[PDB]
Amino acid sequence: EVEALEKKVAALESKVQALEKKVEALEHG
Amino acid sequence: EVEALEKKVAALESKVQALEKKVEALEHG
Amino acid sequence: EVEALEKKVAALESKVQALEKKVEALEHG
């Protein structure tokens, strides 16, 4: 379970960093 | 702790998938 | 590893809540 959580968490961090930048282009900055 | 992390991670995946689509309507696609 | 996952997950929840609100200003609401 821990290794599985590790993969899910790494994927989420990747998606969230991309989302953060996408939105940054639309507002604030 | 692991089960608790599992629930938090599943919730985040759900929120991130919805956010991804919301933003998709605004930009690229 | 578990404590490390805890920190990554807490950070993600924080970022996702902020993103959710940012986007809310742009669409639906």
Side-chain angles (χ1 to χ4, degrees):
Chain A
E1 286 177 58
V2 185
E3 169 177 354
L5 275 171
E6 292 274 32
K7 288 153 71 181
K8 285 180 183 136
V9 171
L12 282 171
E13 292 178 344
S14 188
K15 294 185 181 300
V16 169
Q17 171 166 2
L19 267 170
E20 221 158 29
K21 291 293 186 175
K22 279 197 74 182
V23 171
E24 218 170 274
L26 302 180
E27 65 144 279
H28 194 287
Chain B
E1 286 177 58
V2 185
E3 169 177 354
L5 275 171
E6 292 274 32
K7 288 153 71 181
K8 285 180 183 136
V9 171
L12 282 171
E13 292 178 344
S14 188
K15 294 185 181 300
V16 169
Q17 171 166 2
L19 267 170
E20 221 158 29
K21 291 293 186 175
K22 279 197 74 182
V23 171
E24 218 170 274
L26 302 180
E27 65 144 279
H28 194 287
Chain C
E1 286 177 58
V2 185
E3 169 177 354
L5 275 171
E6 292 274 32
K7 288 153 71 181
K8 285 180 183 136
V9 171
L12 282 171
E13 292 178 344
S14 188
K15 294 185 181 300
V16 169
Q17 171 166 2
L19 267 170
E20 221 158 29
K21 291 293 186 175
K22 279 197 74 182
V23 171
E24 218 170 274
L26 302 180
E27 65 144 279
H28 194 287

